[PDB]
Amino acid sequence: VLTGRTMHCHLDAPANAISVCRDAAQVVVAGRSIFKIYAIEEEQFVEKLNLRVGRKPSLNLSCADVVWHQMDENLLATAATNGVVVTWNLGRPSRNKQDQLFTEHKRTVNKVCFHPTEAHVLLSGSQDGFMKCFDLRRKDSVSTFSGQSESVRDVQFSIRDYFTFASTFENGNVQLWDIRRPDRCERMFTAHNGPVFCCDWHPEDRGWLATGGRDKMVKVWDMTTHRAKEMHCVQTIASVARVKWRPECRHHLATCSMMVDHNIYVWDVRRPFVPAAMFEEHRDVTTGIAWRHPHDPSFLLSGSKDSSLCQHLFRDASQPVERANPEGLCYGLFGDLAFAAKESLVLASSALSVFETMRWFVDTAERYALAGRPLAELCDHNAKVARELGRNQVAQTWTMLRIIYCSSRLPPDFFGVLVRDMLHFYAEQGDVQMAVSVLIVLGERVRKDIDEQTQEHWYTSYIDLLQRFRLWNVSNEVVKLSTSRAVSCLNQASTTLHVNCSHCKRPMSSRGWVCDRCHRCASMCAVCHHVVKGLFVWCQGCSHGGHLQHIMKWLEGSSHCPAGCGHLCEYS
C-alpha cells in the first residue's frame, strides 16, 4: 500500500509544474528558475538531483508543463515558453539528462503529454493553434494537424481508447482527434464562454471528460453518444485550473484556482454548491496538483507559487459542511415565527414553517383621546376605553390622575414626585403608549419633571412603533401636539410644494388662485370647472387634476383623463 503524513518543503523559486513517477515516490517539481527531482521519505523530503546542473542563464530551458512517462524510468519531457521542447533521458551518463530537442513550433508550447502504452509518441499544444506529435525517429518529427481556432491550452490522451485524444482551445470549443486519421476532427462542442484551461478523463468509465474554464465553471461531459451533453456543473468562486479526478472514488474532483483563491477543494459532483474538503495552507495561488497513486486515495501533492511543495492528506482536512449553521429564525410584527432547519434535526435540503403564535395596541391607539376636551373628560374617556379593552390596572390609573388633578388642603406638589415615577414604571416595561399618552394629556403640569432626552426617547420609540403598524393618523397626531419642540417638528421639513402655471410658466406666489401675468384662473377643475381653493390633485403624466373627490369618482368608473388630454393616467 502506502504510508505517510502531511509535509512541507520550502523551495528556492516559484514553481508551476509537478509530475510523479510510476513508483509513487518521486516528484519532479519544475518552473521558471528551478528544475529539481525529489524523493519523499516518511519524515522529510530530500532533493535527489538538480537537473539545472549544467547551468546556463538562458531561456533555452524554462518550464510551463512537465510530463513523466510510465513505460521506462527515465523518459521525461518539458515545455518551454521559448517555443522549444526539451526531452530528457535520466539514463544518460554525464551530468546532463538532455536527450533530444525540438524547435518546430511557432510561438510557445503549453501542455505536453505522452501515451500510456507506446513510448515513442509525444503530443504538444501551442499558442498558434498548431498541435503537433513527435516520435523517436529523429528525422520523423512532424504531424501538424491544426484546428482553425485560438491558442491551445491542454491536450490529453484517453485511458482505454488508446488511439484518440482530447484538446481544449481558447475560444471554448473542445475537440477530439485520432492519430490514424489526422485530417478531420471527430467532434467539436462549445463547452464554455471563455478559455477552458484543463481537462481530465474518468479512470473508471469509457468516456467521461471534465473541463474547467475561466467562467468559474466545472462541467463533466458524456461523449459516448453522437452528441455530447452536460450532466453536472460545479460552481467555484474563481477561475479553474488543473482539474483532476480522485482515485477509486468515481464522484470526486480536485480543482485548484488560478487567481484570488489560494485553497484547494474536492467536490462531490452530486452536490455541487458546497465542497467536501478544503486544504488551506498555501499563501498564494497553487499551480499544480497530482494524486500520488491512481489506486490509493489518501494523499495529494500540490505545489504553489509561494515556493512550497506539500503532500497533504485527506483525513486532515478543513471540512466546511460540519462547520455550518443549519438553521435560521425571525420574529414578526404579528407574533409570527419563521423557523428553518435541515431535515436531519426535525441532509441536502431544509424545511421551514411560519408559527402563527399585540392586538390591544391598535385599539388603544385608535380609541384614545388626547385633546379637544377638558382634563377630567379626557381622563374619564381614556379610563372607559381602557376598562372596556380588558385591562383594569391601566384603567384605574386614569381615574386616579383625574382625582389628583381635577378636584387648608393638601400641599399642591404632593403627588408630583409621585406621578413622576408612574411614567418610569410604565416606560421601563416597553409600554410607551401610556407614558406618551399621559404626557400629552397633562402637558405643562408635568413637563418640567422628566428629562428632555428621556421625553425624546419615548416619543421616538412610540412613533416608530405606530408607524410599523401603518397607523399614520395616530403617528401624526402624536407629532402635532408633542411636548418636545425637537419632536414636534418632523412634518415641517420639505413638505411645501412649489407650484407654477403651465401657461405663463411663472411661479404662483402668495396664497391665491390667479396668475399674476396670465390673469387666468389656473386652479380650475377638470370635472367641476369651478375654482379649487382647497385640496388639488395632480397627474405626473397628464399634468391635470382638480378637486380630490371628483377625480376619485371619475377614476372609479372611467379610465381616461377628464380634461380631454387622452392619456390614461392609470395604466389599466
Partner: protein, 307 residues
C-alpha cells in the same frame, strides 16, 4: 464633437470606444459624476491637452460640481489629492509603480479610499491619458490639420516627464491579460472588464493592407511595449527594425511619451502615398497598446498587496 468624426474611420472600434466612455463617465457607479469629471480633468492635464480639458470643464459644471474646485488643486478634497502621485507615475513612468503607493491609498483614516473606487479611478486615469495621446497625435482643432477628406496648471510637479529606456524589466508571459489580469478585474469591476476586452479584440481585428498584415501590427505592439518595458518571450528584436522606418518611429516614440510636441511637419512625411486610413489605424492601435501596459502594471501592484 470633432474627435468623433476622425475616430469613426472604422465601425468596429467606435462602438466599443463609445460603450467604454458611456460606462466610465455617465453610467452610475461607486463615484459621483462630478468626481469622475474632476479626475478626468486631472488626468488630461498631464499632457497639457486643452481639447479634453475644455470638453470636461463644462461637463463638470453642468453636473452639480463646485465652481470653487476649478480655481486650482489645493482647494480640492484631500481624498482626491492623494491620487496625484499615482497619476504622475501612471502618466509617463509606469515601471516604477509598486505597493507603497497603493497601501498609502488604502490606508485607514478620514480620506481613506475603498477598493471598489480605486479601480474605477485607475481605469479612468488610463483612459484619459491615452485619449489625450490620441488627440495630440492625430491633431484636432477645437477638422484635423493632419489629413483631409484659460488652462491654469492643475498639475503636481509639471517638470516631470518620460525618462530613458526603462530597471528589472518585465516578462510579459508571466503576467498576461487573458489568464489572470482579466480575472482580477472581473471581480473588482464586473462590467468594466468585458468592455475593455471587447475594445482590445476590436483593436486586434483591424489590419492594414499596404505592403503579411499581422507582422506589421506586431512590430508596433512589441516596439511600444518595449519602450515602456514589457519584454516578451518569443521575439527577435532584429526583426523589429525592417518593419518600420525612422520616418515612422520618431512619430511613434514621440507621441507615446511626450505627445505635446508633434507639429504639422512632424507628420508631414509619414511614408509613401498612404491611404490616410492606415495611418489612423496605426495611431489608434497605440491607444490600446499604451493603455494596456499601464493597466497591467497597476493590476500587478494590486495583486501583490492582496497576496
Amino acid at each position: 464633437d470633432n474627435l468623433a468624426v476622425v475616430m469613426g474611420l472604422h465601425p468596429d472600434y467606435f462602438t466599443s470606444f463609445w460603450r467604454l466612455h458611456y460606462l466610465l463617465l455617465h453610467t452610475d457607479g461607486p463615484l459621483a459624476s462630478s468626481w469622475r469629471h474632476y479626475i478626468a480633468i486631472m488626468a488630461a492635464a498631464r499632457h497639457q491637452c486643452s481639447y479634453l480639458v475644455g470638453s470636461h470643464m463644462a461637463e463638470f459644471l453642468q453636473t452639480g460640481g463646485d465652481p470653487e474646485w476649478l480655481l486650482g488643486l489645493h482647494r480640492a478634497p484631500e481624498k482626491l489629492r492623494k491620487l496625484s502621485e499615482i497619476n504622475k507615475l501612471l502618466a509617463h513612468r509606469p515601471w516604477l509603480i509598486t505597493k507603497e503607493h497603493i497601501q498609502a491609498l488604502l490606508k485607514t483614516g478620514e480620506h481613506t479610499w475603498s477598493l471598489a473606487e480605486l479601480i474605477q479611478a485607475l481605469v479612468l486615469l488610463t483612459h484619459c491619458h491615452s485619449l489625450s495621446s490620441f488627440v495630440f497625435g492625430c491633431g484636432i482643432l477645437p477638422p484635423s490639420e493632419q489629413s483631409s477628406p484659460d488652462m491654469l496648471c492643475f498639475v503636481e510637479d509639471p517638470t516631470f516627464g518620460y525618462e530613458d529606456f526603462t530597471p528589472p524589466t518585465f516578462r510579459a508571459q508571466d503576467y498576461t491579460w487573458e489568464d489572470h489580469g482579466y480575472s482580477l478585474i472581473q471581480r473588482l469591476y464586473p462590467e468594466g472588464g468585458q468592455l475593455l476586452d471587447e475594445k482590445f479584440q476590436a483593436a486586434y481585428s483591424l489590419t492594414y493592407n499596404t505592403i503579411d498584415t499581422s507582422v506589421l501590427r506586431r512590430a508596433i505592439w512589441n516596439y511600444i511595449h518595449c519602450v515602456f518595458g514589457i519584454r516578451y518571450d518569443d521575439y527577435d528584436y532584429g526583426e523589429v527594425n525592417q518593419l518600420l522606418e525612422r520616418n515612422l518611429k520618431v512619430y511613434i516614440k514621440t507621441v507615446a511619451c511626450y505627445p505635446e510636441k508633434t507639429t504639422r511637419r512632424m507628420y508631414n512625411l509619414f511614408w509613401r502615398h498612404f491611404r490616410h486610413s492606415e495611418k489612423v489605424h496605426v495611431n489608434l492601435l497605440l491607444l490600446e497598446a499604451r493603455m494596456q501596459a499601464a493597466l497591467l502594471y497597476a493590476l500587478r501592484a494590486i495583486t501583490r498587496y492582496m497576496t
